[PDB]
Symmetry: C2
Subunit: 620 residues, 2 copies
Amino acid sequence: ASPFRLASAGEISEVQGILRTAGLLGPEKRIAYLGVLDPARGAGSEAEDRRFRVFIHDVSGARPQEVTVSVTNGTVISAVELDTAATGELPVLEEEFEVVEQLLATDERWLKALAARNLDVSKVRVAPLSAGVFEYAEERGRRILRGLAFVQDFPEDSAWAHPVDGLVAYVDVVSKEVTRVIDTGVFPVPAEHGNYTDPELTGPLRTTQKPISITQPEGPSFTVTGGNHIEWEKWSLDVGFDVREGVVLHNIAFRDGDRLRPIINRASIAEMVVPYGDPSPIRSWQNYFDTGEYLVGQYANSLELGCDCLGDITYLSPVISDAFGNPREIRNGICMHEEDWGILAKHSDLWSGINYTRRNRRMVISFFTTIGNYDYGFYWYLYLDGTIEFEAKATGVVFTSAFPEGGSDNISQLAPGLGAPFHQHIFSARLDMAIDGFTNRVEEEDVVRQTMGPGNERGNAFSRKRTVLTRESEAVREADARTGRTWIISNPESKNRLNEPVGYKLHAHNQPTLLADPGSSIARRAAFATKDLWVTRYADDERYPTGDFVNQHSGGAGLPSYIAQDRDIDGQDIVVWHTFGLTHFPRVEDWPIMPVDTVGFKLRPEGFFDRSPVLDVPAN
Amino acid sequence: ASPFRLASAGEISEVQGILRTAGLLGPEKRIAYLGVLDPARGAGSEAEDRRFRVFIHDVSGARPQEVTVSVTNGTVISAVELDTAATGELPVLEEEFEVVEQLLATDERWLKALAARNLDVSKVRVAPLSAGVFEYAEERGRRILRGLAFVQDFPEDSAWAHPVDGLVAYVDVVSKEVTRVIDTGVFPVPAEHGNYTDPELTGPLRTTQKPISITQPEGPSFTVTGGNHIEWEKWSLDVGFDVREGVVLHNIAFRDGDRLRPIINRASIAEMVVPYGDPSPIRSWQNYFDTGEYLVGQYANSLELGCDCLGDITYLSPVISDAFGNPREIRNGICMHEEDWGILAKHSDLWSGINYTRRNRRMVISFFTTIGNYDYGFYWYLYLDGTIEFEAKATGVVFTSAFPEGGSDNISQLAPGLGAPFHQHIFSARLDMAIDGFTNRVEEEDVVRQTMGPGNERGNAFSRKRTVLTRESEAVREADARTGRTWIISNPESKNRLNEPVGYKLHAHNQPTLLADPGSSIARRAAFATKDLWVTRYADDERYPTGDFVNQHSGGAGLPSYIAQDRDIDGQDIVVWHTFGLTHFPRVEDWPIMPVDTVGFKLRPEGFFDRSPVLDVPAN
Ligand SMILES: [Cu+2]
Ligand SMILES: [Cu+2]
Ligand code: NA
Ligand code: NA
Ligand SMILES: [Xe]
Ligand SMILES: [Xe]
Ligand SMILES: [Xe]
Ligand SMILES: [Xe]
Ligand SMILES: [Xe]
Ligand SMILES: [Xe]
Ligand SMILES: [Xe]
Ligand SMILES: [Xe]
Ligand SMILES: [Xe]
Ligand SMILES: [Xe]
Ligand SMILES: [Xe]
Ligand SMILES: [Xe]
Ligand SMILES: [Xe]
Ligand SMILES: [Xe]
């Protein structure tokens, strides 16, 4: 009954049937994206209309379509032909991944390059990589992937150990033609294997780890109703899943006494980009928008119990469309569990004689995805004390190259002859705020140092200042760790018992933002990544910081275009877009498989409550 | 047999006996500090000499002494009379805490102040607070505490809810005289109670939290031998305890194949300061050096199982001296346990067909202390992957004041009429480094942006730079979060298999440092707190960033004096001192008892190992 419920297999089959009936899904058509649309603002009192958005590709070369379907009513709402040279190519199809290697295997230029390096074509894997937009005019309006080669010595070998540097190829995956093969010269293909399950490399496995058993004999403290509505320790929300964004949180609210108080209307990772910092022409075009180009949700892992998620786990198994419109379940794709989180509050008071200790917990909602060599975990946390946090966990196998004789300013050495190009992993969290409702504003808060003098004779005073961001033109902000800069989202019409507007404070990690030159292609396509915080006025069609079609799409869409409207954001329905990322100079310890590294952000209540919200937590 | 073993009750009793026999511990003498000294550099092949350092106070007004005793040989090594006006007062004695209230209760000025506010003297608690060094010339050479008043309505009432603003008193705790009583005017004493165990305030306790059971059916994976030597998942160290610093880690090393490789020789929190930012004369002198003035180890809590430390816990019960030299055990004062830490490494490879997941764990060594209203947890973590981390957890009850009519730039409102002055909690971690041995150096590493142009035509390149800190004069460094600044400690004579010096990288949180005006008393006494990183050449007498005697001691000692020596630190025995802290603008959610907030730092291996050190971790 909830309009925020997960898409069911039946709904996807029905979208398929509606499209077929309407003449929009014949044998040459493929679904490159399909997702449920969120309900419009208002229309809660109105009857429900489940609508799905679909991007339809055509393998015969005809123009793709953007389509909206009402599965409730069995109708096509809208259908429009896309001009991809203008608005962008559709996301990469899973079926196109294999096409790069297959086509290159019978290309005379590719074969000549491999023969020069004494490499057997049957052993050469080709990573199918997004192309971006550079100086190649013939690529405009065409679906291109670029291929980098890695040798696989045998079926179970890790090809990443054996990059073939000095070689790159470009392929049109629709017309099935190799457009270009660039060979800048032979590099030695690194010879050491990177097989992290081979006993020769691991040595004898440790026998020293005794078991840790985490159980809940009475079950978990959270409830799941309507498939995806969670209630836990005063929190409530709906766990959505989208093939592009992955896990999406809807209607995050907190029950304070009798009142259900909204905090965040929608929380998602709306984009992530991995720009590479190696100026070699073999990789200088390399920027993976895993969300926008590849769709991270579609590659979500099935998570095994006791391995990926430990404890008393409740799973969701979201359904997505395959390329033909048939439903496909991602079995155990979302993990949900609560875990202990150390001490919540503690005081031993001399005067009263009262000793007091309470323990903390957090609700965890997560998924893990695999994009080629990369594996990312996306974790949302809700804490007893009102804190909301996101954490990304990056692991997998690092993307490799040759390590140049005489070293490199842009590549790390991992093993003899084996390099790892420098890169970043940068995320954009889109937080459609609803602090006590939709009438919100954002202030930038800095610490203020004070000069010793009149009114401050001992030179000890310090303070802070808040600046309201009143319009979108002044709401593109950078970090300032030195001055403890944070951003507070408040509701100017909702006051706490001390007559102060209720609010939440966003605490960033203040990691470096996009490092590329501001005149680069990537600085334009990932403009969002150049600044730490953006605030926009809510609009239903402003979904991603990079726009709807990122693949082979220049600047022109996304956040810079949204804020040009210069809309009022002082006590309005607003959206915060926070950029945060890891800058990775790979270390030898990252090879042959990388230990997890993390980045994230959190929001803490700031006069939202009238006192601590965890006074009613019981002892022990 | 280990020279790093915890002090035993017998050793402390023996120090007492040696001092007594030597004529240094008569009836008027009190021990203000006692701790074991670490073994000297070298002397490992030599027979052991357990030496203790003692600060002896005299209640009759005679000059205190600094004494070194050999408990092994039953001798006094050295004994010197201290001139406290020059070198500093001894740490506050626990017995002096109560003296402030007791003396004030019969003082006519104090009684007049309380009568003006209609407060019953029997209900007025006085916080005994360190005095610092300000403009009062008669305090020089005298042991002074300052008192701030809080009303306790009944025995179990939280006095912190009822601050008596506009009033402060100064007391000589040796001569037992009230030197000054300052009354700047009456403020309303806030009336609401802050009793967080009163059902009227908590409401009905939650019944929604189902149990979480964490057990280890085969016991823990770590071993404890010789009382305090820990071995866990290739790590080894000795867990010390000092009454000043609290838990100290010695000989942190990692067993890589057959070789035990040192990483850190000694790790401690060598100081912590809590400066207040309220310019009111009632509190503008307020700066608590909890480590240096109060001795945090001495107030370590006894930690209850299932409440303070959850899981399979192994406790240490460190012994300290009381004021007369008798041993006193802090029962269950140190917690040791291992815990699961999510995914360690994960990759699902298309080409090889191999799916791989490993789980992480960390060893946790912790204690919790209480200083008046404040409670701090100190946590050290060792991870499977070689990462070392420290985390401080701050909780307790916030220090309160009146909230001024018409607001304040330096105080937050918590409840009607109730204020919380702005302040910081700033820590100094002293890391006596031993990366593969004692020959170490530090480099500052910054990200380097590159300009689009020749050699970087697409404007994607980025790099980094390292600057060796060669001498102490150039080793006082600040954070730069924007450029991803870190510091690498390496051994220039120990190379990994890729011919690069082995190293560890320190990752700071880049929180603001000391905010006080540089000309203030606190900026001089806590000079260490004004900069993020210091590197010194190791010396046995350079123990604390504030020197040996912090109480009522001006600038002149500590880190600024150490680095003036301008010693070679490029491939030498060096010590890193990292400043890190929380800047606290109290929120309503902090009242009436504050949810934990955290700050810390970590160090990660940086080409220390020849490949990932966790390839031998078993599945599941
Ligand atoms: Cu990376
Ligand atoms: Cu604080
Ligand atoms: Na909003
Ligand atoms: Na050292
Ligand atoms: Xe079109
Ligand atoms: Xe929840
Ligand atoms: Xe879907
Ligand atoms: Xe579909
Ligand atoms: Xe791949
Ligand atoms: Xe969550
Ligand atoms: Xe990450
Ligand atoms: Xe003296
Ligand atoms: Xe350990
Ligand atoms: Xe001790
Ligand atoms: Xe003693
Ligand atoms: Xe106290
Ligand atoms: Xe530890
Ligand atoms: Xe803290």
